[PDB]
Design an enzyme around this catalytic site. Structure first.
Site, PDB file in Angstrom:
ATOM      1  CG  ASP B  53      -1.005  -1.441   1.817  1.00  0.00           C
ATOM      2  OD1 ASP B  53      -0.631  -1.598   3.002  1.00  0.00           O
ATOM      3  OD2 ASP B  53      -1.399  -2.387   1.082  1.00  0.00           O
ATOM      4  CD  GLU B 132      34.906  -8.011  15.061  1.00  0.00           C
ATOM      5  OE1 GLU B 132      35.690  -8.621  14.303  1.00  0.00           O
ATOM      6  OE2 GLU B 132      35.165  -7.731  16.254  1.00  0.00           O
ATOM      7  CD  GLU B 134      32.811  -3.627  19.894  1.00  0.00           C
ATOM      8  OE1 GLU B 134      33.715  -4.209  20.518  1.00  0.00           O
ATOM      9  OE2 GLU B 134      32.849  -2.415  19.597  1.00  0.00           O
ATOM     10  CD  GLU B 218      27.736 -16.097  25.145  1.00  0.00           C
ATOM     11  OE1 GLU B 218      26.509 -16.236  24.983  1.00  0.00           O
ATOM     12  OE2 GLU B 218      28.399 -16.811  25.924  1.00  0.00           O
ATOM     13  CD  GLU B 226      32.466  -8.381  18.393  1.00  0.00           C
ATOM     14  OE1 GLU B 226      33.035  -7.265  18.415  1.00  0.00           O
ATOM     15  OE2 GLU B 226      33.015  -9.415  17.939  1.00  0.00           O
ATOM     16  CG  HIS B 275      35.012  -4.336  14.793  1.00  0.00           C
ATOM     17  ND1 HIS B 275      33.910  -4.716  15.533  1.00  0.00           N
ATOM     18  CD2 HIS B 275      35.600  -3.335  15.495  1.00  0.00           C
ATOM     19  CE1 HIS B 275      33.832  -3.975  16.622  1.00  0.00           C
ATOM     20  NE2 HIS B 275      34.844  -3.128  16.625  1.00  0.00           N
ATOM     21  NE  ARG B 346      44.110  -6.396  16.498  1.00  0.00           N
ATOM     22  CZ  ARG B 346      45.292  -6.898  16.130  1.00  0.00           C
ATOM     23  NH1 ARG B 346      46.385  -6.143  16.130  1.00  0.00           N
ATOM     24  NH2 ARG B 346      45.382  -8.165  15.745  1.00  0.00           N
ATOM     25  CD  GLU B 365      38.921  -6.257  11.591  1.00  0.00           C
ATOM     26  OE1 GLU B 365      38.119  -6.725  12.419  1.00  0.00           O
ATOM     27  OE2 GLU B 365      40.123  -6.037  11.856  1.00  0.00           O
ATOM     28  NE  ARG B 367      40.298  -2.918  14.366  1.00  0.00           N
ATOM     29  CZ  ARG B 367      39.973  -3.930  15.169  1.00  0.00           C
ATOM     30  NH1 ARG B 367      39.840  -5.150  14.679  1.00  0.00           N
ATOM     31  NH2 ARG B 367      39.781  -3.722  16.468  1.00  0.00           N
TER      32      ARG B 367
HETATM   33  N1  LIG Z   1      36.586 -14.636   2.813  1.00  0.00           N
HETATM   34  C1  LIG Z   1      36.527 -14.821   4.019  1.00  0.00           C
HETATM   35  N2  LIG Z   1      37.083 -15.945   4.544  1.00  0.00           N
HETATM   36  C2  LIG Z   1      37.013 -16.147   5.888  1.00  0.00           C
HETATM   37  N3  LIG Z   1      36.413 -15.330   6.864  1.00  0.00           N
HETATM   38  C3  LIG Z   1      35.830 -14.143   6.291  1.00  0.00           C
HETATM   39  C4  LIG Z   1      35.857 -13.843   4.851  1.00  0.00           C
HETATM   40  N4  LIG Z   1      35.233 -12.634   4.514  1.00  0.00           N
HETATM   41  C5  LIG Z   1      34.815 -12.203   5.734  1.00  0.00           C
HETATM   42  N5  LIG Z   1      35.110 -13.045   6.946  1.00  0.00           N
HETATM   43  C6  LIG Z   1      34.660 -12.689   8.611  1.00  0.00           C
HETATM   44  O1  LIG Z   1      35.791 -12.248   9.535  1.00  0.00           O
HETATM   45  C7  LIG Z   1      35.051 -12.082  10.877  1.00  0.00           C
HETATM   46  C8  LIG Z   1      35.697 -12.161  12.219  1.00  0.00           C
HETATM   47  O2  LIG Z   1      36.736 -11.493  12.932  1.00  0.00           O
HETATM   48  P1  LIG Z   1      37.490 -11.566  14.431  1.00  0.00           P
HETATM   49  O3  LIG Z   1      36.966 -10.312  15.502  1.00  0.00           O
HETATM   50  O4  LIG Z   1      39.021 -11.332  14.030  1.00  0.00           O
HETATM   51  O5  LIG Z   1      37.242 -13.042  15.091  1.00  0.00           O
HETATM   52  C9  LIG Z   1      34.087 -13.125  10.937  1.00  0.00           C
HETATM   53  O6  LIG Z   1      32.830 -12.538  11.224  1.00  0.00           O
HETATM   54  C10 LIG Z   1      34.441 -13.907   9.596  1.00  0.00           C
HETATM   55  O7  LIG Z   1      33.501 -14.942   9.453  1.00  0.00           O
HETATM   56 MN   LIG Z   2      37.821  -7.168  15.112  1.00  0.00          MN
END
Ligand SMILES: Nc1ncnc2c1ncn2[C@@H]1O[C@H](COP(=O)(O)O)[C@@H](O)[C@H]1O
Ligand SMILES: [Mn+2]
Ligand SMILES: Nc1ncnc2c1ncn2[C@@H]1O[C@H](COP(=O)(O)O)[C@@H](O)[C@H]1O
Ligand SMILES: Nc1ncnc2c1ncn2[C@@H]1O[C@H](COP(=O)(O)O)[C@@H](O)[C@H]1O
Ligand SMILES: [Mn+2]
Ligand SMILES: [Mn+2]
Ligand SMILES: [Mn+2]
Lengths: 477, 477, 477, 238
Positions: B53, B132, B134, B218, B226, B275, B346, B365, B367
């Site tokens: 709608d 990830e 938080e 966890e 997170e 991140h 980082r 990554e 971040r």
């Molecule tokens: N190509 C990939 N191969 C493996 N892990 C990946 C890929 N692309 C993204 N990720 C993600 O990297 C993230 C984790 O980061 P950490 O805080 O270092 O444990 C996870 O959520 C993964 O599953």
């Molecule tokens: Mn991280």
């Protein structure tokens, strides 16, 4: 221009003065003081001076220059109307012990040097400033900043947001007359709740030597008020502004109120600005008029205006020095946001009041400034912006008597406005300050100090703290 | 990549599903919905769709295109663990009635087009995202914005600012264990007050198909938490993020708490970021590794990183889309503010996790992002920044494994950071968006809409309202 | 010494374990954790390990060594009796990614290296520790530190200072039985208000594998309590201490109480100490006995005692690591303040329990330590103090079975006591730590880190804050 | 005059609904309260502290008095900063005279010679380290005895620091002596550094022994045995 030391002794002598309050201005703009017994105040203080115990860390007269010499300015001597013990207030200029050279970071010294520089240009021998500072009268103010929360609240028993209150500030009944009426803003009593308080303020100003001759009015609108008075030469006009704020704040204080000169204390009401009228005179006659020029403006005036509009982005760093300044200089309450001069557009940074063919009455008005800063630095910066315009003959753009709404927002967008945040003007100053350093009026060091103070003490602190409205917008993200 | 319509019918059939919740994403990032009886949910919804709608004024599918067609995405079908009446949640793609063409302003359509474009470049056929997010677990939140005042307050019975409380949230005694300890941030119970709640959240995620295999943990620190899970292809990784936020928020809600994903809810504690790990794959094998290249990075990875760092200033308009985002991206809590990649720094916008010589484990990554926006738009913008880098082979600067403190602040100042305010990145996007419009992924209109929404609904509203700290700084001016 | 990986899988398998809690010790002494799904916990975690996301700023595993490898210690696997979701707790050793070398700042690594070093000296192949930690059971605790004031208050409904209370913690009547009786300290119920709570604690300890065979008692005195259990080899004795504190704190927590292990929570009651029994064994038999030597002490024992008394001033930096430690180690409550060993003087730092001619039962007891620190570091430091004594054959002074009161305070003043403040022992450690660095057990860096942390986070913060008693003494000066 | 001053300040506040405190550090986060003392020796009616040839216009009479102050400061503080609270002020912050050097400049220096130029009469030294938490009779007397031990025996201290100690290497800035950190320290420094005090029979051994006893039993030990509120913030969770 007329009073000297001996006269100050007679004022103190005739008034049975018990104490003498030694005042000087700090960097941001608040007057500092210490008191000495009247018996210790004689010819020695004037020619020889008083040493001020090497204080303060984050700035001013350090310690390898340890002490300072305080030389009194006899023109600023006024009897304090608030202090129980009869006191004489006097402003001083700050110096150092090596060659007793005037401290280049004392705001009062910057203003005096600006007056001397005016003379060193040959353009004129007097710069007249007539600033009109608005303020709010409140009953209370509370605020805090914590890890998990923050708040602020200003209150006025008879504030327009209190129409629904069951009882009043003292448990007494809600008698109404709080709501403001659309458009017209100066109703008579009882809508006007501050008649007697404003009168006490005006009476105190008049008793403190403020000249109320020409179009000087006492006006009030809700909790907001303004009492304009006669102009003065640059330095002493800044001294009058400090005295004015002192008298307004303490008259309110002794009468169970609390005043604020901040640019925007209320979200939903008029901001408070410092509309400054300027002009250059020589030998005793005006220099701002000419019927051949627009609005009866001489070529001396047009270029001063050229400098103001050209240097405005950086000028605002001293003219609108706070984060709160930019809650006023935002879309609304016709705050001078547009960089054009005119007898008409009051939302224009500069307004030439209708004064016709009278050379003396001809004056320009920088309406953009507010009272949140240092008047010595603000007035001085305004002069330096104008002097950079007269000497180098800086041509701005055409005056707009035609209001900017009825017009295509293409040519109205080409109409420059000033920066939107304090961080912007501080950046504009960091790069646009040659006019300031001319004649040695503002030193690079002073400008660097101002930029440092603003970034570390104002910009960053507000910036790292989450705003309450961010919770309304983002808690649910 | 594996599930289809008929399987969704079996999930609904086996579970005695009473209702079907039709979900779609709005512009800023919050999922919208309407419900239909399960009996009305059959093959017709999949191939033919459902009309939504013609709603909303300030944006989306207008009215001279009046209605929309909602085609279900069978991969997103999940049983709702909170709703009393057994409900199946499914995400839909938004369309129009003229040629049933996918609405170019539906965030889910932007993400799907981004996946298709990846294929249209020949570079790879899959973009994997592993974000990830938080969040903070609170007990209460209140705030307002009035003419004379404003406030906000988040509270947690066991928050570290409540050590001095006489009694607790329910009148019960203050049992302590609130103060956080300097440095180390993950203490066991009883300092950890949310053990059982986090477990309910993780249990709910696992029951909702979230994959917890590899380094998926966890974790909790005070009120912050997170729960990272396995990555997914772009579009569906954004769907997982929406599902994650939904499960986190409602698990907290059903257990007497309130969660926030805002970047900076607390002044004096860690901000909340998103991140994001990225990588490109083709035919079933990796494309991000090479031992000859730094950190085991292929030339495919280095250039994607080149695009991220080059386009970051504008990328942040979708990656860190709120005013609150910039309270996190400010000096502190090692929030990725520096535009350099590295296995080490980082506080660098990009971090290549130590994965050695394993081509598959090699991933970059970003971040810097947070969870205050739209994951579909954020992930898509990240891909477009990287693809503009791989194709055009954009070379950034050298990786910094050497930490930026021990080094001269000249070469550390030459280290670029991202803009300081939301208004800045919105300006950087207004000018840096060609990579976005490539392959027709982001339309100029969509980008113009985003810029409009942010300026009118976020930037200006916060900007015109005085901050509580301005009263601390300026009431006395 | 007996359990391995596969057995841990059976514990997890038999118990329908849902989660696995990954634990490791931080520098000061509090266990940290993150949780992984049980399904992700297999042979891979043991030989290969888990990476812990490069965290913490003020210390530990930095970021140019970015990640760490967590290898599980199967001996520490225990089922959590508090967590709703069935969880298995396991302690890990911290490593780095370059050569997977054990991080030299992980307290658990210091303890394991100490056990290995014992072997590298040839002296013995086992160091047994049997520490008895006392604690207080309270109902509430609140405190704060502000600019204008500070306070703290611990409360127990039935505390001896509450005899005059009109009503109780829940509004219920004051039923008495609060006052403590002079001298004797272990009255039966109802004077003993914590009988059932202590039983729950002991039941929980027994269910968590704690061995209660020999003279292991459950004792309570007012709000204070102690549950001693069987000793263990160094590293795992420190693990048992962490587990003990965890079980005591959470049993209290789930039963509406709050426990503290701080050395001196009450001014006017017994402090809480950690009386540690030590001994060296080889091949399966004792090494601490000999009837020819005093108290049945072998020459192996006397020299270990020699090291303890010689190095005590610096040993206390790890053994009594807090500012609060010195409120216990002050004149009163026979806290081991005197640097002499004996079967008698319990106010002596070392006490050899009456065990006669039984070589196995012969053990020394360092009663001076408290539970305010890190057991891994404390036990390790104790071993290093003793090993520096056995190898170098350090001769102390004669044992004092004759109590030090009846004796001339000249020869009783020649009886050394330990330093009076934390700042003193930190200084004594800064200079007395060669025994610590032997065999590479404690690194200079680790010791430097400890000294830094203590000075910046504990000593200085307490030192700059005015004590409430200073107002009683000096407000009127 | 100091006793009279404190009496007038305290009671004026009292009769006007207030309460005054002269304690060194009543607020954690605001300036401490000190007793900056200016000194000088005069004879027959004229000054003895000046000389343009000497630094800051200081006579050789002044330099040695300053020598005694800096030499005996560690023990002098037992009478000059006699309380446990004194050491919350004499701690890193609020430029409290913690550095044992004289100068016209460094105000964080224990001694400061106010800029008085070539005027022999205006020339005076200033021991800024003291506070008003003790006995002014004993504090002033102890200051004189520290200075007299310096003039007679001609005690030479170290060079004046007009150059501020921050811009300088913390090696030569660490070699810059500070005073002890706790009351227990200065009481120990006095227990061993008091010959200048007993000279001429001004302070008796008994008086000094009484002071040391009173401080240990009535101030040092009582505060020391009582847990500080901040210890609960730091250690309740251990
Ligand atoms: N190509 C990939 N191969 C493996 N892990 C990946 C890929 N692309 C993204 N990720 C993600 O990297 C993230 C984790 O980061 P950490 O805080 O270092 O444990 C996870 O959520 C993964 O599953
Ligand atoms: Mn991280
Ligand atoms: N040269 C000048 N001649 C006359 N008035 C001046 C001059 N320079 C500044 N002024 C000030 O212009 C101000 C008033 O503005 P208004 O709100 O229009 O009544 C007053 O405060 C004047 O005294
Ligand atoms: N080698 C050893 N042989 C026997 N008991 C030991 C040994 N090393 C340490 N202990 C510990 O001594 C502790 C108890 O002391 P108590 O308060 O006297 O009952 C227990 O915790 C013992 O298990
Ligand atoms: Mn005006
Ligand atoms: Mn014992
Ligand atoms: Mn002084």
């Amino acid at each position: 221009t007329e009073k000297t030391p001996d006269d100050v002794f007679k004022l103190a002598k005739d008034e049975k003065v018990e104490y003498v309050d030694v005042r000087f201005c700090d960097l941001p703009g608040i007057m500092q003081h210490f008191t000495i017994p009247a018996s210790a105040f004689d010819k020695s203080v004037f020619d020889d001076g008083l040493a001020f115990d090497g204080s303060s860390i984050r700035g001013f007269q350090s310690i390898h220059e340890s002490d300072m010499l305080l030389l009194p300015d006899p023109e600023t001597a006024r009897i304090d109307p608030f202090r129980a013990a009869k006191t004489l207030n006097i402003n001083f200029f700050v110096h150092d012990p090596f060659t007793l050279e005037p401290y280049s970071r004392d705001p009062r010294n910057i203003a005096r040097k600006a007056e001397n520089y005016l003379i060193s240009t040959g353009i004129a021998d007097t710069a007249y400033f007539g600033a009109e500072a608005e303020f709010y009268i409140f009953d209370s103010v509370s605020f805090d900043s914590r890890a998990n929360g923050s708040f602020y609240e200003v209150d006025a028993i008879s504030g327009w947001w209190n129409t629904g209150a069951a009882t009043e500030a003292d448990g007494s009944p809600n008698r109404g007359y709080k709501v403001r009426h659309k458009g017209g803003y100066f109703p008579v009593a009882p809508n006007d709740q501050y008649v007697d308080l404003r009168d006490k303020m005006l009476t105190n100003l008049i008793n403190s030597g403020f000249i109320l001759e020409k179009g000087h009015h006492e006006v009030g609108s809700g909790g907001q008020a303004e009492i304009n008075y006669q102009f003065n030469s640059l330095l002493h006009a800044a001294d009058d502004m400090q005295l004015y704020k002192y008298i307004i704040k303490n008259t309110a204080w002794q009468n169970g109120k609390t005043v604020t000169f901040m640019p925007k204390p209320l979200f939903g009401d008029n901001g408070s600005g410092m509309h400054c009228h300027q002009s250059l005179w020589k030998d005793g006659a005006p220099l701002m008029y000419d019927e051949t020029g627009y609005a009866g403006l001489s070529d001396t005036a047009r270029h001063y205006i050229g400098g103001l509009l050209h240097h405005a982005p950086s000028l605002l760093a001293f003219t609108n020095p706070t984060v709160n300044s930019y809650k006023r200089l935002v879309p609304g309450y016709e705050a001078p946001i547009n960089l054009v001069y005119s007898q008409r557009n009051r939302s224009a940074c500069v307004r030439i009041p209708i004064t016709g063919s009278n050379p003396k009455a001809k004056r320009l008005e920088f309406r953009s400034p507010d009272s949140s800063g240092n008047p010595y630095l603000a007035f001085s910066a305004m002069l330096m912006a104008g002097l950079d315009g007269i000497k180098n003959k800086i041509e701005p753009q055409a005056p707009v008597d035609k209001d900017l709404y009825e017009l295509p927002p293409e040519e109205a967008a080409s109409i420059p406005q000033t920066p939107t945040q304090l961080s912007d003007v501080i950046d504009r100053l960091e790069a646009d300050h040659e006019y300031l350093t001319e004649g040695g009026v503002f030193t690079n060091d002073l400008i660097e100090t101002w930029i440092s103070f603003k970034r570390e003490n104002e910009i960053e602190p507000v910036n790292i703290r989450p705003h309450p409205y961010e919770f309304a917008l983002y808690y649910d993200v």
